[PDB]
C-alpha cells in the first residue's frame with residue numbers, strides 16, 4: 001500500500017445484528033401490524049391462521065393440524081444449517 | 095363512494111366511512127395544509143433534484159479548465175506556438191496538445207454515459223410508481239407511502255416529479271382476550287371474517303382493523319367438527335335468528 | 339502518464355461495480371419491505387410456492 | 388533466512404526484510420506513517436471551533452483532548468458515555484455533535500428507542516381510531532442535453548492542427564453519436580413518465596366533492612403559468 | 626502540477642462511492658423505528674425459533 005487506504009464502515013456488525021434481532025422480534029410478536037403503525041400483539045397460531053386465510057385456505061384446516069404443521073416447520077428449519085454448511089459455493093456471491 | 099371503495103380495499107367496512115365523513119374530510123384538509131410548510135421549512139428536501147443540476151454544471155467547468163493547461167508543452171496558447179516555432183518542432187507540441195485535449199473529452203463522455211444510465215433507472219421507477227399508485231390502489235407494502243395506501247396525487251417539478259401519498263394509520267388501541275373457536279352444542283364455530291374478543295364477562299365478534307363488537311350468530315360463524323381437536327376452545331352460546 | 343492512465347481505468351471500473359452493487363441493494367431493500375413486513379401475492383418473489 | 392539469502396520479499400513483491408552485511412542479522416522494514424486529515428465543524432454560523440481527525444494513525448505520532456478510535460486519532464473533542472442519534476458520522480459507530488458553555492463531543496450511535504411488546508397466548512390488541520396521513524416523495528426524471536463540437540474544442544481555428552487530427556482516425560464520430568443517444572434517451576424518459584393518458588380531462592366548474600378541499604393541488608386560473616400553488620413553490624425553490 | 630486537475634476528480638469520485646456504500650447499508654436494515662424485544666418465555670404454540 002502506497003497512498004492506498006481502506007476506510008471502515010459507519011455501522012458495526014453488532015448494530016446490524018441488533019437491527020435484525022429487532023425485526024425478528026417484531027414479526028414474531030406483532031405479525032405485520034408494526035410495519036404500518038403501532039405494534040399490536042396477537043398469539044402466533046392466530047397469525048398463522050390469518051396467513052392461511054391469505055392464500056385461500058380456511059382457518060379450521062390449520063387449527064386441526066397444528067402439531068403436524070409445527071413439526072414440519074421445525075424439521076425444515078433444522079435442515080437449513082446442514083444444507084447451508086454442506087455446499088461451500090452457496091455463498092459464492094458474497 | 096370512491097373513498098368507500100378504497101376503505102373496502104384495505105379491509106374496512108363501508109359504514110365506517112359514512113359515519114365519519116366530516117371528521118375524515120377535516121383530517122385530510124388539515125394534513126394537506128401542512129405540505130407547503132413542510133417543503134419550505136427544510137430546503138434540503140428538494141436537494142436531490144438540485145444535486146443533479148450541480149453535477150452537470152461541475153462537469154462543464156472541468157472541460158473548460160483543461161483548455162488553459164500546458165499539458166507538458168511550451169504553452170497552452172496554440173497561436174504563439176505557431177508564430178514562434180519552426181515546423182519540425184511545432185508538430186510534436188501540436189500532437190501533445192491534441193492527445194491531452196482528446197483524453198479530457200473521452201473521460202467526460204464516459205461520465206455522461208454512466209450518469210445517463212442512473213437517470214434512466216430512476217425514470218423507470220418513477221413511471222412504475224405513476225402506473226401503480228396513481229392509476230390504482232396498491233397492496234404492496236411501503237411502495238406508495240407508509241401505512242395502508244389509500245390514493246396518490248402527482249405534481250411536476252423542474253426535471254422531476256413529486257408524489258403525494260394519502261394513507262390510513264390505526265390509533266388508540268385497546269387490549270382484549272381472545273379464543274380460536276367457540277363450542278356451543280358439541281360443535282366448533284369459527285368467525286367468517288372477524289375475530290372473537292371478550293369484555294371480561296361477554297364475548298363478541300369484531301373486524302380485525304376497527305373495534306365494532308357484535309353478537310355471535312349463526313350468520314357470523316360456520317361450523318366445522320367437534321370440540322376436541324381445537325386447543326383453546328371456549329364454551330359459550332350462539333344465537334339463532336329463527337325465533338318465531 | 340503511464341501511471342495516471344491506470345488510476346483512471348481503476349476509477350472507471352469502480353464506478354461500474356458500484357452501480358451494480360447499488361442495484362442489488364435496491365432489490366434487497368424491496369424484498370425486505372415486501373416479504374418480511376407483509377405477505378406477498380407476487381409469484382416467485384418471496385420463494386417458490 | 389537460509390544462509391545464502393540476503394533479503395526478503397513480500398507477496399506484492401515489496402522488500403520487507405533485510406540482512407545486515409556486517410553482523411549476520413535480520414531486520415524488518417516498515418513504511419513510515421501517512422494518512423488523511425479531516426476537519427469537523429458545527430458550521431461558521433454556529434461556532435468557530437473545530438475538531439481534527441487523523442485517519443488510520445496511532446495517537447503517538449500526531450505530536451488538548453486526544454482520543455483513539457478505530458477510525459484514527461481525534462483531537463479537540465470530548466468523549467462521553469451517553470448515546471444520542473447520530474449527527475456527524477465519524478466511523479465504526481462513533482458520532483460527534485455540538486452540545487453543552489458549548490463544546491464538541493463524541494459518543495456512540497443510538498439505534499433507537501427500546502420497546503417491549505406484551506406477548507401472550509391469550510391477549511390481542513384492537514385499534515379504536517384512525518388517522519389520515521399525507522407524505523411526499525421526490526424523483527428525478529431527466530437531465531440536461533448537451534452537444535460538443537470536437538474540432539473547434541481541440542484545434543480552435545488553425546488548420547494544420549486539423550490536418551494532424553484527421554490522421555488520428557475516426558475519433559470524433561463516436562462522441563457525437565453517444566451524445567445524441569443520450570439526448571434522445573432524455574426525451575424518451577420524459578414521455579414515458581408523463582404522457583400516460585390518451586385524453587385531456589377537465590374538472591367540473593362547480594368544485595364540490597363532499598367536503599374535500601383540493602384547491603392546493605388544482606390549477607389556479609389567476610396565475611398566468613396556470614400552475615398550482617404547490618407547483619409554484621417547487622418551481623421557485625429550485 | 627503542470628498537467629492540471631485530475632486528482633480532484635478522482636478524489637471526488639471515490640468519496641461519492643464511499644458515501645453511497647453507507648447509504649446502501651442504511652437503506653436495507655434501518656427500516657424499523659424501535660428496538661423490539663422478545664418475551665423471556667419462549668413458547669409460541671409449539672414453534673421453535
Ligand SMILES: *[C@@H]1O[C@H](CO)[C@@H](O[C@@H]2O[C@H](CO)[C@@H](O)[C@H](O)[C@H]2NC(C)=O)[C@H](O)[C@H]1NC(C)=O
Pocket residue numbers: 293294295296
Ligand atoms: C362488556 O360489554 C358488555 C356489553 O356491552 C356489558 O354488558 C352490558 O353492560 C351494560 C352496562 O354495564 C348493561 O346495561 C347491559 O345489560 C349488559 N349486557 C347484557 C346482555 O346484559 C358488560 O357489562 C361489559 N363488561 C365490562 C367489564 O365492561
Ligand SMILES: *[C@@H]1O[C@H](CO)[C@@H](O[C@@H]2O[C@H](CO)[C@@H](O)[C@H](O)[C@H]2NC(C)=O)[C@H](O)[C@H]1NC(C)=O
Pocket residue numbers: 408409410411
Ligand atoms: C566484519 O568486520 C567486523 C569488524 O571490522 C566484525 O565485527 C567483529 O567480528 C568479530 C569476529 O570474530 C567478533 O568477535 C566481534 O565481536 C565483532 N565486533 C563486534 C563489535 O561485535 C564482523 O564480524 C565482520 N563480519 C563478518 C561477517 O565476519
Ligand SMILES: *[C@@H]1O[C@H](CO)[C@@H](O[C@@H]2O[C@H](CO)[C@@H](O)[C@H](O)[C@H]2NC(C)=O)[C@H](O)[C@H]1NC(C)=O
Pocket residue numbers: 117120121515516517
Ligand atoms: C379519533 O381522533 C380524532 C382526532 O382527529 C378525534 O376527534 C377529536 O375529538 C376531540 C374530542 O372528542 C375534539 O376536541 C377534536 O376537535 C376532534 N378532532 C377533530 C379533527 O375533529 C376523535 O374523537 C377520536 N375518536 C374517538 C372515538 O375519540
Ligand SMILES: *[C@@H]1O[C@H](CO)[C@@H](O[C@@H]2O[C@H](CO)[C@@H](O)[C@H](O)[C@H]2NC(C)=O)[C@H](O)[C@H]1NC(C)=O
Pocket residue numbers: 600601602
Ligand atoms: C379550500 O382551501 C383554501 C385554502 O385554505 C381556502 O381558501 C381560503 O379561503 C379563506 C376564506 O375564509 C381565505 O381567508 C384564505 O385566504 C384562503 N386561502 C388561500 C390560500 O387562498 C378555501 O376557502 C377552501 N374552500 C372551501 C370551500 O372551504
Ligand SMILES: *[C@@H]1O[C@H](CO)[C@@H](O[C@@H]2O[C@H](CO)[C@@H](O)[C@H](O)[C@H]2NC(C)=O)[C@H](O)[C@H]1NC(C)=O
Pocket residue numbers: 078673674
Ligand atoms: C428448540 O430447538 C433446539 C434446537 O433444535 C432444541 O435444542 C436441542 O434439543 C435436542 C432435543 O430435541 C437436544 O438433543 C439438543 O442437544 C438441543 N440443543 C441445544 C443447543 O440446546 C430445543 O430443545 C428446542 N426447544 C424445545 C422447547 O424443544
Ligand SMILES: *[C@@H]1O[C@H](CO)[C@@H](O)[C@H](O)[C@H]1NC(C)=O
Pocket residue numbers: 267268269270505510
Ligand atoms: C392490556 O393488558 C395487558 C395485561 O395482560 C398489558 O400487558 C397491556 O399493556 C395492556 N394494553 C394496553 C394498551 O393497555
Ligand SMILES: *[C@@H]1O[C@H](CO)[C@@H](O)[C@H](O)[C@H]1NC(C)=O
Pocket residue numbers: 277328329
Ligand atoms: C363445556 O361444556 C361441556 C359440556 O357442558 C363440558 O364437558 C366442558 O368441560 C366445558 N368446557 C369447559 C372449558 O369447562
Ligand SMILES: *[C@@H]1O[C@H](CO)[C@@H](O)[C@H](O)[C@H]1NC(C)=O
Pocket residue numbers: 466467468
Ligand atoms: C464511561 O463509563 C465507564 C464505566 O466504567 C468508565 O470506565 C469510563 O471512564 C467512562 N467514560 C466517560 C467518558 O464517561
Ligand SMILES: *[C@@H]1O[C@H](CO)[C@@H](O)[C@H](O)[C@H]1NC(C)=O
Pocket residue numbers: 326508509666668
Ligand atoms: C400460555 O402459555 C403458558 C406457558 O407459558 C401456559 O401456562 C398457559 O396455559 C397458556 N395459555 C393457554 C390459553 O393455553
